[PDB]
């Protein structure tokens, strides 16, 4: 590390053959210990009234029926990925 | 009942080294006639005698091969008669009674059943001498009629079975549960029961395709 | 997948409650907590999911899954070709 | 003389080893255990079995097709050479499958379909692709001999596909790599001539370089020329029987063409009327239930205009591609029209394409191993 080379001098670094599919760590596996005050919000937001749970759940329904979700993702994949493929 | 007394013996003969040995033709050529006469069958024993005859053409015996060929033609549309000509030499297909038996065999595989009973020569007592042969070919005629037809004329079914009379046809009409329709034809099979076509967009594949794409 | 397997769990705890709301009429008397409001909920529910019930819908649903599967297949075809060009330059 | 110096020295070295193969496999577990240990490759022990499948078949086919009388070759090999190796208590490892496929290759030179199922029962050990492709090779040929055209065509498609999840390096099918290409090409070409109304499923099985030429062959064969009966049958014969070596062609020895009379003229009878079944099916069923307009329109196609009629039509309908009603009061002909389906290739490809990803991701992680 300093900077990469606009010249064949990068070939001495390329022959190390360093990773470019390298490992990504798993972020969450166990309780963060500060779960505890937001655990105490849940009973107050759930057990006594319908007023405060359903507005967090209503999002899923309209993630299906509304305009072109997977269709627009595959459309952008039809634009992003072919531009990278052509470049290589 | 000599068929039942040779099954165990000839069964171990044809799994050993005795199916390449020409000396075993004594018990084997006897057991080939025991199929024809007693109305039983064994392909392995026929096919071994045919292969031992293809090994040494001199040991070929015409009547023993006719007892193979005629009983191969009772067992159609199987490839028993296909393997017969494979082993029978160029010289040996021009013998008597072989040449007449082979020509009659061609008519059955091409389903020319009216020509089959015309083609018969009735002075060859060997074709009378095979027990149940005259009915076996008729049972193969009616076997193919069930698979391939829905309705047949009373005169038409008679003619295919060698120009049967009204009383002789009563056996063949009763055999597969057939009956006469209103002032007309015999009923062979129902229309939807005969055809059984294959299908577009069955698409059951998701019960395995989703499970391989699972991860 | 967690949204999926709590999906049919809602239908299972619905099968528990729908039983209790039937069972309140089955025993002797009850069911005042349900009747036409639960009737409106369930009629509306089946007017959403699934849709109405011709077999033209079943074939159109199948053709949409065969299209979505052909698209999901084509996403794996492109993963395979994202690989193959990435591979020859590494030789 | 150099000819039979090589031939005789193969058989005499195989007859030597045949005693060692019976002696090791049955009883001497310390000799097999000593043979497990020393080398880094057991592949040398395995290859000599099916190496001698095709080389011994060559040498015995020479001796068969030179001596046509007072038969020494065929009963010596059939009794001793084959059954001693295969019938007895098998070797305590995968070597037992290799002698089974060697014996199946010898069994297939006798034109037969009976013991293929009894051999399959004794193929107890797992079907590795190396053993499985060579099983489907002869099992498909048995279905081809059984007149199961609809079955055998499916079996030839997989073994010609060449995406069968193995690298296949290190000479495991050597000297004959394109025989597996051309024999599966050829034997599949015969089956299509019979049953072309079911197979929409053709496209993965044979490549468009060959489907174009074999496609027009079938049409030119059945419709308008008996020429393709000749050129198809010329290529079909060395592949249908597999006679590994034809002997030296000269007129001074005869000795060779005499066994080729029977070997060839046996397959003459197969393609003879099985081809003439094709032309009946060649005119596609335009109208599924035929009134007087279409029945008489097809009697004109059935054969020549003559004082005897309908009887040949009634014969031609008895074969495996027609099922029908005749109604006598209507005078009507009702018939089956039959097809399969177009959209199956893709879901078989969905794993095959992922093997192009897999082996891609794997082989460059073997290069990423080395140059790192």
Closest CA of chain C from B197, distance in Å: 20
Element (H, E) at D197: none
Number of other CB atoms surrounding residue B129 within 10 Å: 14
Cβ-nearest to B203 among C62, C72, C76? C62
3-state helix vs strand vs coil in chain A, percent to 5: 50, 0, 50
What residues in chain A have their Cβ under 8 A from chain D's Cβ atoms? 15-18
Strands B186-187 and B179-180: antiparallel
The set of residues, in sequence order, having a beta carbon less than 8 Å from that of B174 and lying 6+ positions away, is none
What residues in chain C have their Cβ under 8 A from chain B's Cβ atoms? 59, 62, 65-66, 69, 72, 76
Residue D327 three-state SS: strand
Q: What residue in C sits closest to D364 (Cα-Cα)?
A: C87
Is the minimum CB–CB distance between B213 and chain C shorter than 8 Å?
A: yes
Q: What residue in D sits closest to B152 (Cα-Cα)?
A: D326
**B138 burial class (0-12, 13-18, 19+ CB within 10 angstroms)?**
buried
Cβ-nearest to D354 among C80, C86, C90? C80
User: Which candidate, D136, D236, D225, places its Cα nearest to that of D192?
Assistant: D236
Question: Is chain A adjacent to chain C, meaning 3+ CB pairs within 8 angstroms?
Answer: yes
For D:340-369, CB contacts with A below 8 A are: 368
The set of residues, in sequence order, having a beta carbon less than 8 Å from that of D299 and lying 6+ positions away, is D309, D310, D313
Q: In whole angstroms, what is the distance from residue D172 CA to residue D181 CA?
A: 16
Q: In whole angstroms, what is the distance from residue B119 CA to residue B115 CA?
A: 6
Residue B82: both structure tokens together: 């296909």
Closest CA of chain C from D151, distance in Å: 27
User: Which candidate, B107, B110, B186, B198, places its Cα nearest to that of B149?
Assistant: B186
All chains having 3 or more CB pairs closer than 8 angstroms to chain C: A, B, D
CA distances from C13 to B38, B87, B204, C6, C18 (A): 72, 73, 30, 10, 9
Q: In whole angstroms, what is the distance from residue D354 CA to residue C76 CA?
A: 7
All chains having 3 or more CB pairs closer than 8 angstroms to chain B: C, D
Q: In whole angstroms, what is the distance from residue C38 CA to residue D40 CA?
A: 75
CA distances from D249 to D19, D26, D63, D245 (A): 35, 43, 15, 11
All chains having 3 or more CB pairs closer than 8 angstroms to chain A: C, D
Experimental resolution (Å): 2.9
Is the minimum CB–CB distance between A82 and chain C shorter than 8 Å?
A: no
Nearest-10 crossing angle of helices B98-109, B62-73: 10
Quick one: DSSP state of residue B149? B
């Amino acid at each position: 590390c300093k900077e990469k080379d606009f010249s064949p001098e990068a070939l001495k670094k390329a022959n190390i053959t360093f990773e470019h599919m390298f490992e990504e760590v798993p972020i969450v596996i166990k309780n963060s210990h500060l779960i505890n005050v937001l655990m105490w919000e849940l009973e107050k937001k759930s057990a006594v009234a319908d007023k405060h749970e359903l507005l967090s759940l209503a999002s899923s329904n309209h993630l299906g029926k509304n305009l072109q979700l997977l269709m627009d993702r595959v459309d952008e994949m039809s634009q992003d990925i072919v531009k990278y493929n052509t470049y290589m | 009942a000599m068929f039942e007394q040779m099954r165990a013996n000839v069964g171990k003969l044809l799994k050993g080294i005795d199916r390449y040995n020409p000396e075993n033709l004594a018990t084997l050529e006897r057991y080939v006639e025991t199929q024809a006469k007693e109305n039983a069958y064994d392909l392995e024993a026929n096919l071994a005698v045919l292969k031992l005859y293809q090994f040494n053409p001199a040991f070929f015996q015409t009547t023993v091969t006719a007892q193979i060929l005629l009983k191969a033609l009772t067992n159609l549309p199987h490839t028993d008669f296909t393997l017969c000509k494979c082993m029978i030499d160029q010289a040996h297909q021009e013998e008597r009674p072989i040449r007449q038996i082979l020509y009659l065999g061609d008519l059955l595989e091409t389903c020319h059943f009216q020509a089959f009973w015309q083609a018969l020569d009735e002075n060859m007592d060997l074709l009378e001498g095979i027990t149940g042969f005259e009915d076996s070919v008729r049972k193969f005629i009616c076997h193919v009629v069930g698979i391939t037809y829905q309705h047949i004329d009373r005169w038409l079914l008679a003619e295919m079975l060698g120009d049967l009379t009204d009383s002789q046809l009563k056996m063949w009409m009763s055999k597969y549960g057939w009956s006469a329709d209103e002032s007309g034809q015999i009923f062979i099979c129902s229309q939807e029961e005969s055809i059984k076509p294959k299908n577009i967009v069955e698409k059951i594949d998701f019960d395995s395709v989703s499970s391989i794409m699972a991860s | 997948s967690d949204l999926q397997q709590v999906g049919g769990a809602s239908a299972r705890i619905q099968d528990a409650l729908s039983t209790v709301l039937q069972y309140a009429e089955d025993v002797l008397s009850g069911k005042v907590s349900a009747d036409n409001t639960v009737g409106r909920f369930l009629m509306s529910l089946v007017n959403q999911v699934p849709k109405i019930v011709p077999d033209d819908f079943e074939t159109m649903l199948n053709s949409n899954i065969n299209d979505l599967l052909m698209v999901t297949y084509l996403a794996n075809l492109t993963q395979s070709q994202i690989a193959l060009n990435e591979k020859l330059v590494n030789l | 003389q150099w000819l039979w110096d090589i031939i005789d020295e193969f058989i005499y070295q195989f007859q030597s080893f045949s005693q060692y193969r019976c002696k090791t496999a049955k009883k001497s577990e310390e000799e097999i255990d000593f043979l497990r240990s020393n080398p880094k490759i057991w592949n040398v022990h395995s290859v000599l079995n099916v190496l001698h499948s095709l080389v011994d078949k060559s040498n015995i086919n020479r001796q068969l097709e030179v001596y046509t009388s007072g038969g020494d070759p065929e009963s010596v090999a059939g009794e001793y050479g084959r059954h001693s190796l295969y019938k007895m208590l098998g070797y305590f490892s995968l070597v037992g499958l290799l002698r089974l496929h060697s014996l199946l290759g010898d069994y297939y030179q006798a034109i037969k379909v009976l013991e293929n199922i009894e051999l399959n029962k004794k193929s107890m050990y797992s079907r590795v692709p190396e053993c499985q492709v060579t099983t489907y090779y002869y099992v498909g040929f048995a279905y081809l001999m059984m007149r199961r055209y609809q079955d055998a065509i499916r079996v030839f498609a997989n073994i010609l596909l060449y995406i069968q999840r193995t690298k296949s390096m290190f000479q495991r099918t050597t000297y004959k790599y394109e025989m597996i290409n051309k024999q599966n090409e050829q034997m599949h070409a015969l089956l299509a001539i019979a049953l072309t109304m079911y197979p929409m499923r053709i496209d993965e099985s044979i490549h468009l370089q060959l489907r174009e030429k074999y496609g027009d062959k079938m049409l030119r064969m059945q419709k308008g020329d008996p020429q393709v009966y000749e050129e198809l049958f010329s290529y079909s014969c060395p592949k249908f029987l597999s006679p590994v070596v034809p002997n030296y062609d000269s007129v001074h020895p005869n000795y060779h063409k005499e066994p080729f009379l029977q070997q060839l003229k046996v397959f003459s009878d197969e393609v003879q009327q099985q081809a003439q079944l094709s032309t009946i099916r060649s005119f596609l069923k335009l109208y599924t239930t035929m009134p007087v307009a279409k029945l008489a329109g097809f009697l004109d196609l059935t054969e020549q205009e003559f004082r005897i009629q309908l009887l040949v039509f009634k014969h031609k309908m008895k074969n495996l591609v027609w099922t029908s009603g005749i109604s006598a009061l209507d005078g009507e002909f009702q018939s089956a029209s039959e097809v399969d389906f177009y959209i199956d290739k893709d879901m078989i490809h969905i794993a095959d394409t992922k093997v192009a990803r897999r082996y891609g991701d794997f082989f460059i992680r073997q290069i990423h191993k080395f140059e790192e």
